[PDB]
Structures are given as C-alpha cells and as structure tokens.
Amino acid sequence: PQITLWKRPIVTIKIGGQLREALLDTGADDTVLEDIDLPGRWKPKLIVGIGGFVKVRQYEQVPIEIAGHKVVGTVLIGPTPSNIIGRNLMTQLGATLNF
Amino acid sequence: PQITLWKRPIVTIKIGGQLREALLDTGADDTVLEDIDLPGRWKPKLIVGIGGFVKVRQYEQVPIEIAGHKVVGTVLIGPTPSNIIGRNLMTQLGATLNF
Numbered sequence: 255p256q257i258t259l260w261k262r263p264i265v266t267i268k269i270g271g272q273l274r275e276a277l278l279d280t281g282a283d284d285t286v287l288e289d290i291d292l293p294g295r296w297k298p299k300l301i302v303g304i305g306g307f308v309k310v311r312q313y314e315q316v317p318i319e320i321a322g323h324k325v326v327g328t329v330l331i332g333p334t335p336s337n338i339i340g341r342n343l344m345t346q347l348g349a350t351l352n353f
Numbered sequence: 354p355q356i357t358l359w360k361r362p363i364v365t366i367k368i369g370g371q372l373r374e375a376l377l378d379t380g381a382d383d384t385v386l387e388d389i390d391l392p393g394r395w396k397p398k399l400i401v402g403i404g405g406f407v408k409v410r411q412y413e414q415v416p417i418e419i420a421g422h423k424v425v426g427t428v429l430i431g432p433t434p435s436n437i438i439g440r441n442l443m444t445q446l447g448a449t450l451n452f
C-alpha cells in the first residue's frame with residue numbers, strides 16, 4: 255500500500271498468535287513492542303530516545319506478520335509508549351519514503 | 354525523491370540561516386531539533402518517548418528548508434539524541450510510505 259502521513263501510520267501485526275497494532279517508524283532502527291509474550295531465550299539491551307534509556311529483551315528470528323506480510327527478525331520487548339515497527343523490519347517489506 | 358530504509362533517512366535542513374541534518378521520522382508527530390537558535394517568543398511543552406520525558410520550547414510558524422523544500426511550521430527545540438522531522442512537516446512535503 256501507499257499511505258500519507260496526516261495520521262499516524264498504524265498497521266496490524268500478528269506475532270506469536272497475538273494480534274496488535276504498531277506504528278511504522280522510519281526514525282526507529284529497531285522494532286519495539288510492549289504488550290506481547292514471546293517464548294525462548296533473549297538478551298538484555300538498552301536503546302535510547304527522547305527521555306533517555308529503556309531496558310528491553312532482544313528476541314532474535316521472531317516470525318511476525320505486518321500488514322499481511324510474513325517476515326522474521328529481531329523484536330525488542332520493553333516499555334514503549336507505542337508499539338513500533340523499525341527499519342530492521344520495514345526493509346523486509348521493501349518500504350520506501352517518497353516526496 | 355524516493356528512498357529506501359537500509360540506512361537512516363537523513364536529509365539536510367536549513368533553518369534560521371543554520372544548516373543541519375535531520376532524520377525523516379514517521380513515528381514522530383512533531384519536529385524536534387537540538388542543535389539550533391531560534392528568535393522570538395515560544396511556549397514550554399513536554400514530549401514522551403522511549404526513556405520518558407523531554408522539556409522542549411515550541412516555536413510556531415518557523416520557516417524551514419527540508420531537502421530543498423520551503424515549508425513553515427512548528428519546531429520544537431530541546432534535548433533529543435537526533436534531530437527529527439516529524440509528520441507535522443512531512444505532510445507539507447506530500448511524503449508517503451510505500452510497500
């Protein structure tokens with residue numbers, strides 16, 4: 255799809271059988287979700303934003319469906335005021351900015 | 354221009370005769386710059402992010418050049434680890450996300 259930016263660019267995701275919404279965030283290098291259960295081992299990571307530090311769990315090679323498209327990548331779990339899809343996963347959709 | 358997202362989407366800006374770089378950030382509702390002098394009256398505002406709070410100065414109807422294109426809008430001045438162009442100004446470029 256093509257979308258304009260007069261509203262937040264929010265898409266539906268499906269990850270570990272759970273349905274959520276997330277913002278498509280070109281300013282985010284990495285994908286961060288709050289409201290979600292993932293199984294398996296993870297690694298502690300810090301990431302750093304307007305406001306400073308957030309401690310997150312890094313889960314590798316997580317299957318995720320974003321606006322209907324199946325990809326696999328790193329998902330960071332941690333407190334974030336909004337679930338965000340970062341460039342790590344947007345590059346797998348072949349996403350572009352246009353103006 | 355059309356750009357892909359394998360690297361950060363960084364563009365050149367010109368604002369109050371100062372040249373800077375900024376990230377095109379679809380996850381940001383508002384534009385926030387750190388490294389910059391604007392004249393005139395402003396208003397205190399807070400914005401939350403990964404990591405918590407940032408106190409900013411809101412400057413209205415600021416002329417700014419983004420990747421060559423002249424627009425006028427609200428610019429927030431405050432600590433941010435990176436200068437960001439938010440949707441407030443991306444909508445004035447007719448920017449779209451595509452995948």
Ligand SMILES: CC(C)CN(C[C@@H](O)[C@H](Cc1ccccc1)NC(=O)O[C@H]1CCOC1)S(=O)(=O)c1ccc(N)cc1
Nearest residue numbers: 281282283284303304335336380381382383402403435
């Ligand atoms: C350059 C910074 C700002 C990068 N952030 C991305 C930005 O899009 C960020 C996303 C967000 C949306 C809603 C609430 C909170 C945060 N928007 C943001 O703060 O919007 C503010 C600034 C003015 O407009 C409102 S981040 O969240 O720190 C981040 C950092 C690293 C990773 N891996 C993921 C996210």
